[model samples]
Target: NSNICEVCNKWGRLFCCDTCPRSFHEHCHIPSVEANKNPWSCIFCRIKTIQERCPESQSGHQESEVLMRQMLPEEQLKCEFLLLKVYCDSKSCFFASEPYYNREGSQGPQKPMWLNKVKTSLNEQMYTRVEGFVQDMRLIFHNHKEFYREDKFTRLGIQVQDIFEKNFRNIFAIQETS
Candidate 1:
């Protein structure tokens, strides 16, 4: 029947890979199916992309391209911090214009549980341990959440841009770069 997958020539749902934006059918390229309705960047695809774009070692990989890899730790921290600040800031700057969450209330498509936890620690008034607390908070976030999940990962990336713009007192400025 016509229901067969074009890539695998096997019977399956007419769905696509969670990682591929193009929507590739399961059993065609991917080996299995997941019930997750939310978008997810599969670990396999993420690792493959990382390997292709980044080498684990600085000596073995191109220096410039390593930007994403080497900078990932810092970038992620920056992203998380930015995400938190943008959410907390009531000014509604241009950077915070885009609706990161689905609704106006705290409840939305994206949740900021981790951000809240980090903020609590930051606001504890422990000036001396704030830096280490931030790092520990990030470690908790990475450990608790899937690093490759697109919804979460993409949201963080967008937050990074927003935070940077807000820092400069221009939210729309960063979007102009793209």
Candidate 2:
């Protein structure tokens, strides 16, 4: 039996994906599935297939990059800070000793005070930035160094540091030179 179902993460009859390392229970598969469909593709693989098929249009890409480049210094710093905060939270790197300071138990990080001040909703620009961040992480994870030092930090941590430095630090250096 598999460790757990991909959908519910509970013990059950499992079906493995042909394309990816994901498995699902008979009842838990989203959009449902018929077992008779012998060669089944998991939802994760299906979504990836959809993404690779379309791959976001070129106009959207140009517009998002131009928008990112046009932000003021303060605006850029705030954007970087917000993006870093999301990265840290996603990787479970807590700034405090307790998981949640004001609240009890593991509720994740307390909602940042600045969260309200920043745009509460995500627009295409914000979505693009977040997508870029995730994509960078995905690339780093996939191409991770075989000789990574476990004693230093988790694999994710090392990937994050490398990605952040290359993307942010290198960009700032280029910006300063020209």
Candidate 3:
């Protein structure tokens, strides 16, 4: 009773897409596998790369790209948040902040003293979430690569701004008297 490509229902070996996670057989779907015997496509992946590319598709290639970037084992993102602490790496990266002792040798900006300190507070959480949103946006732009349109980053940025503003307002609204 075992059988065919899980997606097309065609006869072939089992393969699956590593990115979005779809099942398929290399011969049944992809044109070539080269020397690598990696899993190829599956039903879910077909829905994403194939069916979802259509005009009406709400498929979140952009969102998934962002999420996937954060999930990456290694990444290089030069932080530009502040002038003094201008360059920074991915939050997930171990070298997010460089050591202070190396500042003179590198002659570059050093990591903030409080960078590693974790303090719990509404302000911190709000800031962290906004930063997370921005990181996600960066991922979207990165995933689409050079082919990406500026409009997409603009739209995503606007949406993130709204979220940031809403949370900021809520926090200040709790305070009495200016």
Compare the candidates by TM-score and give the number of the best one: 2
Ranking by lDDT: 2, 1, 3
Candidate 2 residue pairs that clash: none
The model with the greatest lDDT is: 2
TM-score rank order: 2, 1, 3
Q: Lowest lDDT 10-mer window, candidate 3?
A: 75-84
Give lDDT tens digits, candidate 1, residues 29-138.
32233557566553234444544564442133232332233323333333333434444343313222223344232343232334344444444533233234434434
lDDT of 2 by residue, 1-178 (tens): 2567764566667788777776677645533455577677765565445446655521223323433544443333434443433343334232112222232332322232222222222222443443444344333333332223343433654655454544443223223332
Question: In candidate 3, which residue ranges exceed 4 Å CA deviation?
Answer: 1-4, 7-12, 37-178
lDDT of 2 at 111: 34
**What TM-score does each of the candidates earn?**
0.23, 0.32, 0.19
**lDDT tens digits, residue span 1-178, model 3:** 2355533456656655566533455533323233464644332343335334453433323333433343111111111112102111122122223323232222322223222221111123323333443443343323322222453533433443343333323321223233
- Which candidate model has the greater lDDT, 1 or 2? 2
Model 1 regions more than 4 Å off = 1-84, 88-113, 136-153, 157-178
Residue-pair clashes per prediction, in order, are 2, 0, 6
- The lDDT values for all models are 0.38, 0.42, 0.32
Error of 1 at 142 (Å): 5.0
